[PDB]
Scaffold this active site. Structure first.
Site, PDB file in Angstrom:
ATOM      1  N   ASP A  16      88.777 -28.643  18.724  1.00  0.00           N
ATOM      2  CA  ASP A  16      88.416 -28.647  17.486  1.00  0.00           C
ATOM      3  C   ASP A  16      87.941 -29.812  16.706  1.00  0.00           C
ATOM      4  OD1 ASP A  16      88.189 -27.737  14.674  1.00  0.00           O
ATOM      5  OD2 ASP A  16      90.178 -27.742  14.265  1.00  0.00           O
ATOM      6  N   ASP A  66      81.274 -28.445  13.999  1.00  0.00           N
ATOM      7  CA  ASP A  66      82.463 -27.814  13.783  1.00  0.00           C
ATOM      8  C   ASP A  66      82.879 -26.816  15.091  1.00  0.00           C
ATOM      9  OD1 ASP A  66      85.379 -27.145  13.689  1.00  0.00           O
ATOM     10  OD2 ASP A  66      84.988 -26.385  11.423  1.00  0.00           O
TER      11      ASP A  66
END
Ligand code: E5V
EC number: 3.4.23.46
Length: 377
Positions: free
Chosen positions: A35, A220
């Protein structure tokens, strides 16, 4: 020396990419979500209906309790836990072991995903957004500080089970073709970048480029969709509607609620437009563009009926916290998180998206004037 790290990522579509890690002495093995949109390293540490295994602090002789609690909210999910440190390794990564902060997750809401096959999360962004505050050193900062691993990593996320590569400590040139194009990291918190132009089938959206980065734009890997600010989302959907108006789609398809299906092998790709995002470049008045195919933002999902049709969810959605360049944007590109030089590179991936008549691309140089005005303050 990076071949050991190629193909070290797995996942289910729309459920995130994970890498195998060990924590503790003796090593406990866990699958950890990759992440770049957060900065905490956290693992399941207590039973949960969706966890097949979890971190057991009692069984690790190297565990140290930090006697502080922690919580991290994400877009919809959230967890809380106990902070501590322990020894961590990545079997299909660099041959090192680090003492890293670990948040042991004891309670959670809509965080773990049923059947995702991962039990924790590896936030690769900067300390500035770490919880509870920026003094909790993120994992990657610990890795660089305690070893000789260079201060960069790259992510090759591949589409339609999914796989990919996280090259830790460098760039593996066999994973991409053409040139790398770099955009500055505007600020070290999220991986923030500046979008200077948006085109749909070659037609400029003709918005104030500040709208594209209101109130920020980030890269992201932990979010599936391209998420767009309200005004940009409406302009993009209107334009996408116009391109595909040959066919009518339920009002809830454009909101990500209803899927659309076609007889297997008859998806009308050519009626959906390509999307080009122009990013700020490295030199004055210079940008580059990445081009996204409908095969990227029409995400394949399992057929919920008894049909043997191809079904897709619309993977562009509205945001109130800025642009998010999520997994559907990153798939098909090799993305270099060059922290040492404060920049992010894009190149066509070896696993790039294939059409018969169109192709995902990274192209430059372009001239773009007044790029500085596109940042939001
Ligand atoms: C479109 O909106 C809903 C939505 C969809 C998705 C992920 C998130 C939200 C999300 O929250 N991602 C998280 C990512 O840190 C973000 C969170 O908001 C910002 C950071 O704040 C701290 C931007 N970085 C990481 C995350 C969390 C829980 C579960 C996940 C990922 O499962 C991965 C598979 C699903 C990916 N798809």
């Amino acid at each position: 020396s990076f071949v050991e790290m190629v193909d070290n990522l797995r996942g289910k579509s729309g459920q995130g990419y994970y890498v195998e890690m060990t924590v503790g002495s003796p090593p406990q093995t866990l699958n950890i979500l990759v992440d770049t949109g957060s900065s905490n390293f956290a693992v399941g540490a207590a039973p949960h209906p969706f966890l097949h295994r979890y971190y057991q602090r009692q069984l690790s002789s190297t565990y140290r309790d930090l006697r502080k609690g922690v919580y991290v909210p994400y877009t919809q999910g959230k967890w809380e836990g106990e902070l501590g440190t322990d020894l961590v390794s990545i079997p299909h990564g660099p041959n090192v072991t680090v003492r890293a902060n670990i948040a042991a997750i004891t309670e959670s809401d809509k965080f773990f995903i049923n059947g995702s096959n991962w039990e924790g999360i590896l936030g690769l962004a900067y300390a500035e957004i770490a919880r509870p505050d920026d003094s909790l050193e993120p994992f990657f900062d610990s890795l660089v500080k305690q070893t000789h691993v260079p201060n960069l990593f790259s992510l090759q996320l591949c589409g339609a089970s999914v796989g990919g590569s996280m090259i830790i400590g460098g760039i593996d040139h066999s994973l991409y073709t053409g040139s790398l194009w770099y955009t500055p990291i505007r600020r070290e918190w999220y991986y923030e970048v500046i979008i200077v132009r948006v085109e749909i089938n070659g037609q400029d959206l003709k918005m104030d480029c500040k709208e594209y980065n209101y109130d920020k734009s980030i890269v992201d890997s932990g979010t599936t969709n391209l998420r767009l600010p309200k005004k940009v989302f409406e302009a993009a959907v209107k334009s996408i509607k116009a391109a595909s108006s040959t066919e009518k789609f339920p009002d809830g398809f454009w909101l990500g609620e209803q899927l659309v299906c076609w007889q297997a092998g008859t998806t009308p790709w050519n009626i959906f437009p390509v999307i080009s995002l122009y990013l700020m470049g490295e030199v004055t008045n210079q940008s580059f563009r990445i081009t996204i195919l409908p095969q990227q933002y029409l995400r394949p999902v399992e057929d919920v009926a008894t049909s043997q049709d191809d079904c897709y969810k619309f993977a562009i959605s509205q945001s109130s916290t800025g642009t998010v360049m999520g997994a559907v944007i990153m798939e098909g590109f090799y993305v270099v998180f060059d922290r040492a030089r404060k920049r992010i590179g894009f190149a066509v991936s070896a696993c790039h998206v294939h059409d018969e008549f169109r192709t995902a691309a990274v192209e430059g140089p372009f001239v773009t004037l007044d790029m500085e005005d596109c940042g939001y303050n």
